Amino acid sequence: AAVFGIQLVPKLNTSTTRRTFLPLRFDLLLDRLQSTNLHGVLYRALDFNPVDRSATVIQTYPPLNAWSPHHAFIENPLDYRDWTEFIHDRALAFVGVLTQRYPLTQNAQRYTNPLVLGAAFGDFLNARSIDIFLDRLFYDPTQDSPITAITKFPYQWTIDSNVTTDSVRTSAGCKYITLYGYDPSRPSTPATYGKHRPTYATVFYYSTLPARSRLL
Amino acid sequence: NQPLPRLTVAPTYDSAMSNWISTTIAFFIRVVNSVNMTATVNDLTRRTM
Amino acid sequence: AQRQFFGLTYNFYGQPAPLFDLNDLQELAGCYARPWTSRFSHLAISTGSLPVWSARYPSVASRNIVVNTLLGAHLNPFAGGQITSHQGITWRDPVLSSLAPVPAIQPPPVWAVAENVLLDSNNYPTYVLNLSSMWPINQDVHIMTMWALSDQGPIYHLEVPVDPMPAATTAALMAYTGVPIAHLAQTAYRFAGQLPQSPDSTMVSTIRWLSAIWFGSLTGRLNRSRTCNGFYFEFAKPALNPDQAVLKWNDGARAAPPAAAQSSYIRCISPHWQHQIVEVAGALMSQSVTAVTGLPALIDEATLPAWSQGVANLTGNGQGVVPCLDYNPVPMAAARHLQWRQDGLITAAQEAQLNNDYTAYALTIERHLTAMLVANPIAAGRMPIQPFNAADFGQAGQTAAAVALAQAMFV
């Protein structure tokens, strides 16, 4: 059959199982961040040009995809040169801030909290005090990942991570950042989907279903 | 929009408002240092702007 | 809030079309005003203040029983998806604000006269997309479905958390003391019928506790002596119309909290319900709660009409069910008195009279319904009285069971 202009082949085929959500341990998060090359481990140039170390767009992964740049980073974007350098620096210098508050040797076997870790790292890049996020950078798998964000504290003030009793309003990540020299003009550049922007979405995390009705 | 703060406020440079003033004032700084401007309008005056 | 309700229309009692007259549509759902949260604007402090006797609607409950039938014929959206129209009448807009004569050039497809159509607040993708606005239509279809799943008396729900009354629930009630059972369901109804209120909202606990106390009173237990957290309803002395009820915070022994969650669906069983302003304002009120909270669980199937079996989302039969009890005003009140008599509330020779007093009363709200029944046939396409066959009146339903469900609910 066909839906509008799109044609759909007869056969139906989907994955048949779902991998249980696995929260990254504190050590793995520490290695992912402090690896020789962050490229691939953290971020990944979508279309890196061989000739010269240049990349129009860069799709990012987890502890980075959360981050949403401040105006000063958007205006006057950097080149794939200092970009790798910027992160290869900040990713490391961030591990410091976070590890000195939680000596790895004693507490590495503790799952970091996907959410806070994101905002805690994204806020670090934008250069915002990261004191508050650390308090609960971990959480026992039993307590919901989005619940620890609420139970630990109902702090409705920190921009980009307003935690209420039932929901956590944070600015969506940026699965795509665009290094200077990017243009949606060329048909070749990878489809960024507007996410190269900082505030294109607003991920509202909710605790329970009734908590969600109240949100919608 | 942001929730009312119960602590102490200090003019911050983040926020739509603030950013809107910062990028736009960054645009007219570009209008002033542009080809057109640069050729006509004097030099030292264009710095003042 | 709450975005999910499942309804079931009335049953065209062995009749063709929906038992409601056009003269009715312009008597409740007319005037163009939103016929929604209006159900309650037809009740008084009691019965002696209403045109609920010999008239177009000869019953203190003959209104809702009609407005409910009228709602069935105009709820096709939730049945299928489109708006439709029943006899030159169809909601003006997609928000179902009110009814109005079919346009002229762009008329909605004439409704399909079908009885007992289920409803899903989902079959209408616009409902939830506007929730706030047409919030009312929810709580209403609910009031309907709680009278429809039944044939002889609405089926509400009862609760009692194992905890003590929610403080701001002992404060909200202590400001509704003198108020009559009627004006209580008033606030109750009027409340859960505008702006989607979260089931967490204070009021729901209060108005849900006010439906648990009312029941304890209706079965002696929560009497002038054994109060809930301090409340209990005092019924008017039968001899001058005992069909009353007023909330009264006292200070006698507090009926200790139950040993567990006490849930049960109770419905008046004899025709008597149709004319007892208290057996309606109470039941109607207990339904105000369910309306803004989905539906505790599935109402037991066992004792229930034939058109209410396995009613998807509503009725049950398995585990997700709660035994549904049905009491009879007289067999009830009798025990309600015996309870008082046991707690020294009254004399040992006063209960064998209290019953006389009240029993004669029930015999009055009996020769009246029968009269109105054999006055407004039913083959007359209308149902202000709702058939009942001179029998159910004495019918000693569950009763004995609910009299026990009351004790375990207020130990």
Side-chain angles (χ1 to χ4, degrees):
Chain A
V3 174
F4 294 125
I6 300 172
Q7 305 275 310
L8 310 176
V9 300
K11 306 304 182 178
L12 298 184
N13 164 38
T14 44
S15 60
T16 44
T17 25
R18 24 256 282 187
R19 51 170 39 181
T20 70
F21 176 60
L22 185 176
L24 190 64
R25 273 225 262 144
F26 181 60
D27 43 297
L28 268 291
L29 162 281
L30 255 294
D31 317 324
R32 180 180 252 173
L33 267 170
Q34 296 188 313
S35 58
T36 55
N37 180 55
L38 268 304
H39 177 266
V41 181
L42 187 76
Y43 76 89
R44 180 186 191 178
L46 224 306
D47 58 349
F48 174 82
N49 166 36
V51 180
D52 248 311
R53 298 192 180 187
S54 184
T56 308
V57 181
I58 295 179
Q59 176 233 45
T60 68
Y61 303 109
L64 184 65
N65 80 284
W67 167 52
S68 62
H70 53 70
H71 63 295
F73 174 89
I74 309 160
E75 78 189 317
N76 175 22
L78 28 166
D79 347 301
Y80 190 80
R81 298 188 175 184
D82 61 352
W83 162 255
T84 74
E85 183 216 60
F86 176 82
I87 276 194
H88 279 292
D89 180 332
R90 302 308 293 177
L92 183 68
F94 163 95
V95 155
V97 172
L98 153 170
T99 201
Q100 73 167 43
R101 187 78 199 313
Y102 293 105
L104 193 161
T105 57
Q106 190 57 13
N107 57 298
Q109 307 179 305
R110 223 203 302 179
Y111 304 110
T112 51
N113 183 310
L115 300 180
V116 63
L117 207 175
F121 181 98
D123 280 27
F124 176 81
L125 301 198
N126 287 311
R128 299 177 178 181
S129 293
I130 191 189
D131 287 19
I132 66 173
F133 295 112
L134 295 178
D135 88 308
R136 63 195 186 191
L137 222 177
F138 308 82
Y139 84 86
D140 171 15
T142 72
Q143 305 182 357
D144 339 321
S145 172
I147 203 182
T148 295
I150 67 179
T151 178
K152 179 64 180 184
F153 250 106
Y155 200 63
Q156 178 192 27
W157 297 267
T158 167
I159 311 177
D160 295 335
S161 203
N162 310 337
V163 194
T164 71
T165 52
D166 45 338
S167 63
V168 181
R169 176 179 85 183
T170 61
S171 178
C174 290
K175 324 300 172 298
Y176 298 91
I177 72 281
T178 51
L179 280 51
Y180 156 89
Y182 158 78
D183 71 313
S185 187
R186 298 176 188 175
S188 301
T189 62
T192 191
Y193 300 121
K195 284 89 152 308
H196 60 275
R197 217 51 187 168
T199 167
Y200 68 89
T202 310
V203 188
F204 275 102
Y205 290 95
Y206 60 85
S207 51
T208 65
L209 259 183
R212 178 201 145 173
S213 291
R214 165 272 204 171
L215 264 182
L216 275 322
Chain B
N1 160 275
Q2 229 60 62
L4 185 71
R6 314 243 304 172
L7 261 193
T8 318
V9 298
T12 108
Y13 290 12
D14 56 80
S15 101
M17 179 57 131
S18 169
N19 140 44
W20 167 246
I21 295 178
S22 181
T23 56
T24 178
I25 291 303
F27 178 88
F28 280 62
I29 209 188
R30 166 178 193 165
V31 166
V32 166
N33 290 333
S34 81
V35 169
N36 291 322
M37 208 60 154
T38 292
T40 46
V41 160
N42 163 279
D43 164 35
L44 84 89
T45 208
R46 174 183 59 182
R47 170 145 314 175
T48 297
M49 269 169 279
Chain C
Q2 170 56 71
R3 46 206 287 175
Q4 193 70 311
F5 73 75
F6 305 81
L8 180 272
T9 315
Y10 269 18
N11 178 185
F12 303 172
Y13 292 106
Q15 224 83 206
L19 296 179
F20 88 85
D21 191 11
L22 155 66
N23 208 173
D24 298 9
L25 205 177
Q26 297 175 58
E27 191 49 66
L28 311 172
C31 359
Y32 262 25
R34 41 207 341 265
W36 285 147
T37 311
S38 179
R39 307 179 67 67
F40 225 93
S41 66
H42 313 161
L43 311 164
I45 198 173
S46 70
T47 294
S49 185
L50 292 184
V52 305
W53 303 89
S54 299
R56 276 285 297 181
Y57 307 84
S59 174
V60 80
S62 184
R63 292 297 186 302
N64 289 297
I65 193 68
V66 155
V67 75
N68 269 312
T69 313
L70 195 160
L71 257 292
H74 301 310
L75 281 180
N76 182 289
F78 297 116
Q82 346 160 54
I83 188 142
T84 75
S85 62
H86 179 65
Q87 304 181 305
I89 298 304
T90 181
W91 310 91
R92 310 175 96 295
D93 39 290
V95 189
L96 316 171
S97 69
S98 60
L99 309 182
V102 178
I105 41 70
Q106 183 188 301
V110 186
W111 179 61
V113 184
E115 72 172 5
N116 263 77
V117 59
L118 306 179
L119 302 174
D120 175 6
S121 62
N122 269 160
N123 303 173
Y124 199 3
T126 203
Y127 169 66
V128 189
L129 287 176
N130 295 65
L131 198 70
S132 63
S133 303
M134 63 182 86
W135 171 239
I137 187 170
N138 151 49
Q139 175 259 285
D140 268 301
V141 177
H142 184 297
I143 304 299
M144 175 188 90
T145 313
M146 288 308 243
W147 290 36
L149 275 178
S150 180
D151 71 297
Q152 218 60 57
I155 306 176
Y156 44 108
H157 178 277
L158 302 178
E159 272 180 301
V160 268
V162 191
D163 336 292
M165 289 198 78
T169 292
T170 74
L173 285 184
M174 303 174 101
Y176 282 156
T177 310
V179 188
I181 179 66
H183 309 186
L184 294 192
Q186 170 75 310
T187 295
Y189 177 73
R190 177 87 279 171
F191 161 66
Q194 57 179 57
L195 292 304
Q197 282 324 56
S198 176
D200 304 57
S201 72
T202 319
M203 193 37 70
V204 170
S205 304
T206 299
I207 243 59
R208 184 181 57 178
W209 267 99
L210 205 283
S211 60
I213 292 176
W214 146 252
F215 175 69
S217 304
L218 193 58
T219 316
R221 207 65 201 174
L222 278 185
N223 55 279
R224 180 268 303 306
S225 168
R226 185 192 296 90
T227 71
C228 177
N229 183 51
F231 313 78
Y232 71 84
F233 290 70
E234 180 58 299
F235 310 79
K237 308 166 187 174
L240 329 174
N241 179 191
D243 185 51
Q244 257 296 182
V246 176
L247 176 45
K248 301 263 284 299
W249 182 82
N250 177 58
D251 63 293
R254 311 306 192 188
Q262 280 295 189
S263 298
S264 167
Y265 287 91
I266 293 179
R267 73 180 184 177
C268 199
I269 198 173
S270 80
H272 289 155
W273 85 269
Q274 300 169 318
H275 205 190
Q276 289 189 296
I277 184 68
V278 76
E279 297 294 64
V280 157
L284 195 300
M285 157 171 64
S286 304
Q287 308 180 311
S288 298
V289 174
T290 333
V292 292
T293 207
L295 185 62
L298 296 178
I299 63 175
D300 181 52
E301 190 176 60
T303 171
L304 229 70
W307 65 82
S308 303
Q309 272 40 62
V311 187
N313 294 87
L314 298 166
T315 308
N317 67 306
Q319 304 311 301
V321 304
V322 188
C324 171
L325 314 171
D326 325 310
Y327 66 79
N328 185 315
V330 180
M332 172 58 99
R336 189 263 301 304
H337 291 169
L338 171 61
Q339 181 61 300
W340 293 4
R341 202 285 302 176
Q342 282 165 47
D343 288 303
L345 284 180
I346 51 173
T347 308
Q350 283 192 298
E351 81 145 355
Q353 178 54 51
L354 246 185
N355 293 315
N356 282 176
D357 304 304
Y358 181 91
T359 201
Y361 154 79
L363 201 76
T364 285
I365 315 304
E366 192 179 68
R367 297 182 183 181
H368 174 288
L369 283 182
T370 281
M372 306 313 113
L373 192 292
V374 189
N376 285 188
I378 198 171
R382 289 235 296 151
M383 185 179 94
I385 294 302
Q386 180 185 66
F388 55 66
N389 163 59
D392 291 56
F393 280 118
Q395 177 200 187
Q398 309 280 172
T399 303
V403 167
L405 174 278
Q407 288 201 48
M409 196 161 105
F410 293 85
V411 196

